Amino acid sequence: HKSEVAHRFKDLGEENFKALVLIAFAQYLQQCPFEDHVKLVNEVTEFAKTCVADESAENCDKSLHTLFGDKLCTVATLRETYGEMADCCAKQEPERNECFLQHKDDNPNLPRLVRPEVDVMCTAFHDNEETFLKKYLYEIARRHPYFYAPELLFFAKRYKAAFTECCQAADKAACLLPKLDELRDEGKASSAKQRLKCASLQKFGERAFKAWAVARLSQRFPKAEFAEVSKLVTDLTKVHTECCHGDLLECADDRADLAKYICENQDSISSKLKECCEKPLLEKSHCIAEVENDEMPADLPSLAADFVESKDVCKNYAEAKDVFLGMFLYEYARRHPDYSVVLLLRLAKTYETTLEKCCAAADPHECYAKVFDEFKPLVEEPQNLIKQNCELFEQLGEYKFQNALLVRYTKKVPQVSTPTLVEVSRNLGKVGSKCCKHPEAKRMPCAEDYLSVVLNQLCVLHEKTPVSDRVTKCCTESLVNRRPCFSALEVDETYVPKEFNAETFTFHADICTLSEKERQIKKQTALVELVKHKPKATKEQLKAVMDDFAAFVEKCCKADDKETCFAEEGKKLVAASQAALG
Ligand SMILES: *[Se]c1ccccc1C(=O)Nc1ccccc1
Ligand SMILES: CCCCCCCCCCCCCC(=O)O
Ligand SMILES: CCCCCCCCCCCCCC(=O)O
Ligand SMILES: CCCCCCCCCCCCCC(=O)O
Ligand SMILES: CCCCCCCCCCCCCC(=O)O
Ligand SMILES: CCCCCCCCCCCCCC(=O)O
Ligand SMILES: CCCCCCCCCCCCCC(=O)O
Ligand SMILES: CCCCCCCCCCCCCC(=O)O
Ligand SMILES: CCCCCCCCCCCCCC(=O)O
Ligand SMILES: CCCCCCCCCCCCCC(=O)O
Ligand SMILES: CCCCCCCCCCCCCC(=O)O
C-alpha cells in the first residue's frame, strides 16, 4: 500500500496498534523505562494518525521497517545502554533491521517479576486500568523479546478479563489466583513450544517438520484431499521457518497470508472455520490454529489395498518416496485423531523402514505383507501406559500420585537434583490430573502436548547443569522418541546410596504455618531425599514411614510446645524409620 502504517492502523485499530507498538519496542529496547516506551508509543500513534488522515503526508509512504528502525535510532540512550546495538544505525535497510534482530537478548538480566497481593493488584487495576495493564505488558514483553507479539496481546486480553471478573468477587483471591496460575502456565508453555519447534527444525531438517505437519493437518482436516494437505504443509513450513528467523512483520505477513488462503478455500479444507474466518486479521490465524479437528468422513476403507496389497507398492514408492510416505501418513492420521502426532510418525518411520528393506528383497510383496502387524505394539504401548497411570491416578489423587511418581523417578535417575525431581514430578502429576479426565479418544493428544511441555522444562533445566548421561540422551533424541526414551529408563543399579544427613530429616514448627503448597513441597523434598538415602526401601516400608511422618506432623503441629515436640518426636521418628528400613 502507499502508506503501510496507515493501512496497519486502519485494520488493527488504535488500541491494538498501540499495544503491538509497545510490545515491539519493549522487545527491542528491553532496558528502557515504561514511561519512555509510553512516550514513544504516543509519538508513533500520532504519526500514524497523520498518515491515516492523508496518505501523502510526509514520511507516510516509507516502509514499516524503515520507520521502525528510524524511531529506534532516534533513542538518545541507545549507545550508553545497549552498546553495539547502536552500531546497527549506521547500516542501510534491510541490514539495519537484520542487525537489530540479531541484537535482541533472549535472557535479559532483570529481576523476577513478583506477583503482588490480590488486593493491591485489584486496587492498582481499579485506580488506573490502562496503566496497570500496559505496565505489565511492558514488563512481560521486555523479558520475552522473541515471543510472538499478537499472542502476547491475546494473553493480555484474558488477563484483563480475569481482573475484571475477580476484583468484584466476594473472595477475590480464590477467584483470581487460579486464573493467574492458568495464564502463567499457558504462556510459559507457549513460549517453550515456540523455542522447541524452532530448535527441532534447525537440528533435524525441514523434512521431519513436514512429516509432522502432514500428520497434524491430516488430523485437523480429514475431509481434505492429500494435495490440499500437502499445499498446507509446504506453506506452514515456510511460515514456521520465517517465524523462527524472528522478524515480527515478515512472520505476521506469512501467517496472515496462510490464514486468508485457508479462509478462501474453506470448502476444500474444513467445515468448522466460518467464525474464525469472519474474525479480524489480527486474530484469524490464532483462531484457525486453535479450532478442534473436523469430523472424519464416514466409512473410510483400510489402508491395506493401497499400501500392502497393491502389486505396484514398490513402484509407486520408488517413483517419489516422500509423496508416497506423506500419502500413507495422511491416510493414517485422518483416520486416527485419537493418536499423538509422534505415534503416527513412528508408524510412518516403521512403514518406510519396511519398504526400504522389502522393495530390495527377493519377494517384496511377501516381505511387507505383515507390516501392519508391526504397528500394533507401537500403538498399544502408550495406550497401556495411559491406562496404568490413569488407574493409579484415580486410586491415589493428585498429591499421592505425585508421591508415587516421586519414588519411581528418584529410583530411576537419583543423580538429578532434588528440586528438579520434585518440580518435574509435580508437573507430571498435574499432567495426570489434566488428561485422565478426558475420554480415551482424546487422552493421547492431551498427554503428548502436556508431557512435551513438562519434559522440555526438565531437559532445559538439565542442560543448564548436566548430571546424567541418560537424561542427556533422551533430551537430545528426536522428539518422536524423546518420551519413549524417558519411559524406557530403568532403576539405576549402579547408584551409591546417599549417606545419612541429620539436618535433611530435621523438621521445625514453621511447617505448620507454611502454605499448603510449600508444605507439600517440603514433604516431597524430604521424601526424595529419603529415597536417595534408602533406594532399596520397599513400598510397604516407605508407606509405614510416611504414615508415621503424617502422625508426627499432626501431633506436633497441634502440640502446645511445637519446637521441642518437633525435636524430640523427630529424633524418635528418625530412629524408628532407620530401624524399619534396611
Ligand atoms: Se533506554 C534507558 C535505559 C535505562 C535507563 C533509562 C533509559 C532511557 O531513559 N531511555 C530514553 C531516553 C530518552 C527518550 C527515550 C528513551
Ligand atoms: C500470573 C503471573 C505471575 C507473575 C506475574 C504477576 C503479576 C501478573 C499480572 C498480570 C497482568 C497482565 C499482564 C499482561 O498484560 O500480559
Ligand atoms: C520462559 C518463562 C520464564 C518465566 C516468565 C515469568 C513471567 C510469566 C508471566 C506469565 C504470563 C506470560 C507468559 C509469557 O509471556 O510467555
Ligand atoms: C492408477 C492410480 C491408482 C492409485 C490408487 C488410488 C486410486 C483412487 C485415487 C483417489 C483416492 C486417493 C487419492 C489420495 O491419495 O488422496
Ligand atoms: C511501526 C509500526 C509497527 C506496527 C505494525 C505491527 C503489525 C503487527 C501485525 C500482526 C498481525 C498478525 C496476523 C496473524 O498472525 O495472522
Ligand atoms: C500456531 C502455529 C500455526 C501458525 C500459523 C497459523 C495457521 C494455522 C494453520 C493450521 C495449522 C494448525 C497448527 C496447530 O496444530 O496448532
Ligand atoms: C508430503 C511431505 C512428506 C514428508 C515426508 C514424510 C515421510 C514419513 C516418514 C518419516 C517420519 C519421521 C519424521 C521424523 O524424522 O521425525
Ligand atoms: C527399539 C528402540 C525404538 C525406539 C522407539 C520407541 C517407540 C515407543 C513405542 C514402544 C513400542 C515397542 C517397540 C519399541 O520399543 O520401539
Ligand atoms: C505421568 C503421566 C500420566 C499420563 C499417562 C502418560 C502415559 C505415557 C504417555 C503416552 C502418550 C504420549 C505421546 C506419545 O509418546 O505418543
Ligand atoms: C525427573 C525425571 C523423570 C523423567 C522420566 C519421566 C517419565 C515421563 C514419560 C511419560 C510419563 C508416563 C509414562 C511412563 O510412566 O513410563
Ligand atoms: C497426605 C499427606 C502425607 C504427607 C507425606 C509426606 C511424606 C514425607 C516423608 C518424610 C519421611 C520422614 C522420615 C525420615 O526422616 O526418616
From Swiss-Prot:
The record marks K197 as: Aspirin-acetylated lysine. Glycated in diabetic patients. Phosphorylated by FAM20C in the extracellular medium. It is found in: Secreted. Ca(2+) 1 binds at E4, E242, D247, E250. Changing R112G: In Yanomama-2. It comes from the Eukaryota. GO terms for molecular function: antioxidant activity; copper ion binding; DNA binding; enterobactin binding; exogenous protein binding; fatty acid binding; identical protein binding; protein-folding chaperone binding. One of its GO terms (biological process) is cellular response to calcium ion starvation. It is linked to Hyperthyroxinemia, familial dysalbuminemic: A disorder characterized by abnormally elevated levels of total serum thyroxine (T4) in euthyroid patients. It is due to abnormal serum albumin that binds T4 with enhanced affinity. It comes from Homo sapiens (Human). The modification N6-succinyllysine is found at K203, K434, K517, K562. The gene is ALB. (4Z,15Z)-bilirubin IXalpha binds at K238. Keywords: Calcium, Cleavage on pair of basic residues, Copper, Disease variant, Disulfide bond, Glycation, Glycoprotein, Lipid-binding, Metal-binding, Methylation, Phosphoprotein, Repeat, Secreted, Signal, Zinc. Cu cation binds at H1. Residues 1-184, 185-377, 378-575 form the Albumin domain. This is Albumin. InterPro entries: ALB/AFP/VDB (IPR000264), Serum_albumin-like (IPR020858), Serum_albumin/AFP/Afamin (IPR021177), Serum_albumin_CS (IPR020857), Serum_albumin_N (IPR014760). Changing K370E: In Naskapi/Mersin/Komagome-1. Ca(2+) 2 binds at D11, D253, D257. The modification N6-methyllysine is found at K532. Belongs to the ALB/AFP/VDB family. SMART domains: ALBUMIN. The record marks 2, 18, 39, 62, 71, 91, 104, 134, 157, 172, 179, 188, 193, 203, 210, 238, 260, 272, 284, 357, 370, 387, 400, 412, 430, 434, 464, 473, 498, 517, 522, 536, 539, 555, 558, 562, 572 as: Not glycated. Changing D373N: In Nagasaki-2. GO terms for cellular component: blood microparticle; cytoplasm; endoplasmic reticulum; endoplasmic reticulum lumen; extracellular exosome; extracellular region; extracellular space; Golgi apparatus. The modification Phosphothreonine is found at T81, T418, T420.
